[PDB]
Design a protein around this ligand. Sequence first.
Ligand code: K
Ligand code: K
Ligand code: K
Ligand code: K
Ligand code: K
Ligand code: K
Ligand code: K
Ligand code: MG
Ligand code: MG
Ligand code: MG
Ligand code: MG
Ligand code: MG
Ligand code: MG
Ligand code: MG
Ligand code: MG
Ligand code: MG
Ligand code: MG
Lengths: 83, 141, 217, 183
Amino acid sequence: MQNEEGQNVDLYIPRKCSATNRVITSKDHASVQLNVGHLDDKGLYIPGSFTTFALCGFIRAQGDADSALDRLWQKKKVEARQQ
Amino acid sequence: GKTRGMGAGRKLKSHRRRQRWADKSYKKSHLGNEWKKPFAGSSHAKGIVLEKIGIEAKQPNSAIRKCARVQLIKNGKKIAAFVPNDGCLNYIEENDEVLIAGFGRKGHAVGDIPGVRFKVVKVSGVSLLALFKEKKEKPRS
Amino acid sequence: KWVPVTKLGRLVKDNKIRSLEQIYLHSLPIKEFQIIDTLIGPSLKDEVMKIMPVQKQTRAGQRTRFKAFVVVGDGNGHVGLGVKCSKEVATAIRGAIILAKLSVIPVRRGYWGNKIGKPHTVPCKVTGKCGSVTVRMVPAPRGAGIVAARVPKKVLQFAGIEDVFTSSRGSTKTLGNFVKATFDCLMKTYGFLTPDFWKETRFTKSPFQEYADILSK
Amino acid sequence: VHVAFYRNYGKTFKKPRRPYEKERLDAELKLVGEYGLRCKRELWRVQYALSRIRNAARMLLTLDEKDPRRIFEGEALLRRMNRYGLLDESQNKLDYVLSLTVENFLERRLQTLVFKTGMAKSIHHARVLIRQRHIRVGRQVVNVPSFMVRLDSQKHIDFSLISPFGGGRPGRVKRKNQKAAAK
RNA sequence: UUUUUUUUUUUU
RNA sequence: UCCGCCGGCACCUUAUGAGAAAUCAAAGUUUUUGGGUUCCGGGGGGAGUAUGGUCGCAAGGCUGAAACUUAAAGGAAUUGAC
RNA sequence: CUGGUAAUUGGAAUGAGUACAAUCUAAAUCCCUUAACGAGGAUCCAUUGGAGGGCAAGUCUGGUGCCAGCAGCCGCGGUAAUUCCAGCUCCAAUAGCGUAAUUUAAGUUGUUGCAGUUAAAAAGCUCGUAGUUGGACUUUGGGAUGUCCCGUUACUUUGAAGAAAUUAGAGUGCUCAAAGCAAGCCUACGCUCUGUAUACAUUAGCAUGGGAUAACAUUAUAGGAU
Ligand SMILES: [K+]
Ligand SMILES: [K+]
Ligand SMILES: [K+]
Ligand SMILES: [K+]
Ligand SMILES: [K+]
Ligand SMILES: [K+]
Ligand SMILES: [K+]
Ligand SMILES: [Mg+2]
Ligand SMILES: [Mg+2]
Ligand SMILES: [Mg+2]
Ligand SMILES: [Mg+2]
Ligand SMILES: [Mg+2]
Ligand SMILES: [Mg+2]
Ligand SMILES: [Mg+2]
Ligand SMILES: [Mg+2]
Ligand SMILES: [Mg+2]
Ligand SMILES: [Mg+2]
């Protein structure tokens, strides 16, 4: 949200679920954030480089977090040349 | 569920009209029974005192509530009217002329007094409040 | 003085975390009220809303305890609610103040129409429900004021909302449920996905990951 | 038909919805004492006027900016607020009308102005001076404290020319004392 | 599987 | 015996749902309120009574008030006592 | 220096009243104006309801003792009554306030917008005419540039017309205000052509553009179109 002038007005921008697109609220203590490390040509972890995924409590309580994260990681690894 | 047809306005109107009668307030003011009641739809009514009566207070209270039996002049109906304030029954006599008002709950008993829906406002053309405070004096005749 | 027992408390005492928005972003639980006192303590105000006695029947009579309802807020988008039951009124009030501090949440404020100046009302239509009590907030134009009962009005005032229309259904004379429904309605402000939030989220390191080395000792 | 029946009249205030709000009572008493009002009815009348003006402004602000009705009525309302000193030239938007408080209207009372320019030692002194025909706005004597002074007329406030404080002919008490002292 | 009825009014 | 599809009587687990809860996979998709449609309730009594009509051999059925009276009656669940 | 109190002191101010006079008026009266009078306990003396909670205000003092009484509701009163009868003090409004059909609050009549397992509630079950409701499908696109190419209704847009008064609203110092429709410059033997705007208005009727969503009627025994 912005003013007519163009100033940012919101207190903060909440994160969104990587799978459901839902807004992750401040009291959502079932939500998690995961970093998947990247590997070089020799299968060694490159420090500081990873793909970040966030899951809201709703999807994790449903048990669908595993498959959603698997699909998201597969797509992101295909895009990022991590194989 | 409710009817929602665009051509179903008549049914909705008729259903509301029929169901309004289940409302007690609506039925009271649309049955035309207020004219058969002692006041016949008036705020006040004059009457003649027939007899002083003591009414026992309801549980858990214990008292003798002082009331008067009054006959309304305009229709001859007989009612019970409470006489408020300490010793104000002494200002009432048989065959006296009294102005009667409602007890404040629109035709229902008030407090620990059972079956009394009226109170005395004036006696012999002088308000009971003035008599209680000695502002005025009850006419001798 | 204060000895933090949590990573968040250690970071807040070490000045690594400086704004409540940093904690709100990652949805981290806050389990020490000293965190709130350090972060937004100076601007916070408290108010006891109700002292409610409750009784438990026992073999030798009724054991009476008192329920304290406390509302805290900075009047600038932060508000918290606290409920505590104790044998003594003072202990209940202290516990309720602590719980209200621990439960402070961010409140999103938007514009009714034209977006000039600071936000004055709720961004959208939100509804809260506690027990049978349901509280609905509707955006209102500038100058409409807070059209609400005294309990919701106080809760909204502590949240910094300038004008809003409200409606309530159910047993609003249950003060606890009324205030809790108002609080739930206010919390739901930041959960509604609007077009202005359609932008892709760009994640940032969590405080436990950003300051992992410091917390490693 | 009685032609007098066609004259119309209206109320100027409303009673509070809740009679016994302690905070409302405290605030109202503070305002009444600060401005030396005789009762809560004057404050409620000022509140009624402010509410009417704010409702008109809020209604106008809902219309489209290019709506001719909005343009006309907004200009009229802004001119009205500027004439009576409620709004300053910089405050040239209907939005600033919504930011008007009862204190703004109270500050335009002839009593408050008479106290402020220094013609009275206190707000109550200003009240008694006004109701005793010692004050004039232009060439017209005014004895109504609720008189709302316009910006143009503010600088013309002065003592009545027929009063002891504005001209000659001292009061009856002074004349009686002078006559008594003559012996 | 014998038999076992009752406890003035208000208040704590 | 095994794997499936349709239809049916049910059951078990679960909440991301609802609910005042008890509970409910329909009692969900409801203040973010609108798929179509019938019936039907409006504090507790008086009362399913009076009166009129209608059906019935009868018993009674259907339709169905008012005067008056009253601050609770009532639902779910908690602790204790029994 | 800054504030609050005092039937302590001190002089100032003034209208309620009173009254020459003028003014007003058909004539009077009132208002406005104004000679002479008119305030210290400024006796020129403010009242109506309340003080347990809802709901602002006393665990003050005396009396009564489930009596008398209060109390819209919950409740007070049984010999230590914040609740009755009184004194004091305090609170709300204030020249007003109390008491005895109708609106809101009432999403407790629910079209917007309520309910029907156990709170009041779905007919024992099925059929069924009125009523209400009713699946999909018929011309889209580009080129260009509002314009060119390949039966009856509902509904919506626009316009006319649609008494005033009342409502909203523009202007205007009746001393202010409720009002009213006035009025303003300058004292010119006058002027502002002075103003006395504007908006709103269910349904139904009249005229007009649109042809999505809908309703009624029709289709093939060709007795059809040309
Ligand atoms: K009794
Ligand atoms: K009693
Ligand atoms: K008793
Ligand atoms: K009270
Ligand atoms: K005694
Ligand atoms: K005593
Ligand atoms: K009381
Ligand atoms: Mg026996
Ligand atoms: Mg009933
Ligand atoms: Mg109080
Ligand atoms: Mg006593
Ligand atoms: Mg007393
Ligand atoms: Mg209901
Ligand atoms: Mg039952
Ligand atoms: Mg039932
Ligand atoms: Mg049944
Ligand atoms: Mg039938």
